[PDB]
């Protein structure tokens, strides 16, 4: 069964589409949930039809109690705020991190901690 409360220290990953074809969209996921961002929905948490994005562009994952991004050697390269990510390198996501992938697709990283305010 198991039915309690439990206190999470990992903030939810909220990908806000600041730019791209989805510009104006936003998603939310739980901590420890890999978010494979690609072009085709097929086997992917998020799919963007910006062309610049490939089926298996990159994948998003967490590390224990943090968020990290990894560029699956995409055909172009991923940008973070103002730095090109690497395939053989993993960076830790933050609060207000802009992910510029594809051609003109930007994703904002927002850490949602707690129930929707209101």
DSSP string, 80-117: ESSSB--TT-EEE--TTEEEEETTTEEEEEEEE-SS--
CA distances from 96 to 19, 39, 67, 80, 81 (A): 14, 23, 13, 10, 9
Closest CA to 48 of 74, 20, 69, 24: 20
- The CATH number corresponding to 1-118 among 2.60.200.20, 3.40.1010.10, 3.90.1150.10, 3.10.290.10 equals 2.60.200.20
With residue 48 as reference, give the H or E element that holds it.
none
Sort residue 96 into left (φ over 0), alpha (ψ -120 to 50) or beta. Answer: left
Which single residue is written with the structure tokens 């220290």?
9
Q: How far apart are CA 17 and CA 46, in angstroms?
A: 11
Q: How far apart are CA 110 and CA 16, in angstroms?
A: 7
Q: How far apart are CA 117 and CA 80, in angstroms?
A: 28
Technique employed here was NMR
Closest CA to 37 of 61, 5, 6: 61
CB 55 within 8 A of CB 38: yes
């Amino acid at each position: 069964g198991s039915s309690g409360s439990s206190g999470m220290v990992t903030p939810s990953l909220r990908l806000v589409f600041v730019k791209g074809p989805r510009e104006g969209d936003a998603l939310d996921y739980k901590p420890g949930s890999t978010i494979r961002v690609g072009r085709i929905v097929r086997g992917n948490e998020i799919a963007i039809k910006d062309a610049g994005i490939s089926t298996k562009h990159l994948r998003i994952e967490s590390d224990s109690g943090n968020w990290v991004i990894q560029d699956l050697g995409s055909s172009n390269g991923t940008l973070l705020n103002s730095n090109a990510l690497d395939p053989e390198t993993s960076v830790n996501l933050g609060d207000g991190d802009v992910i510029k992938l594809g051609e003109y697709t930007s994703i904002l990283v927002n850490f949602v901690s707690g129930p929707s305010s209101g």
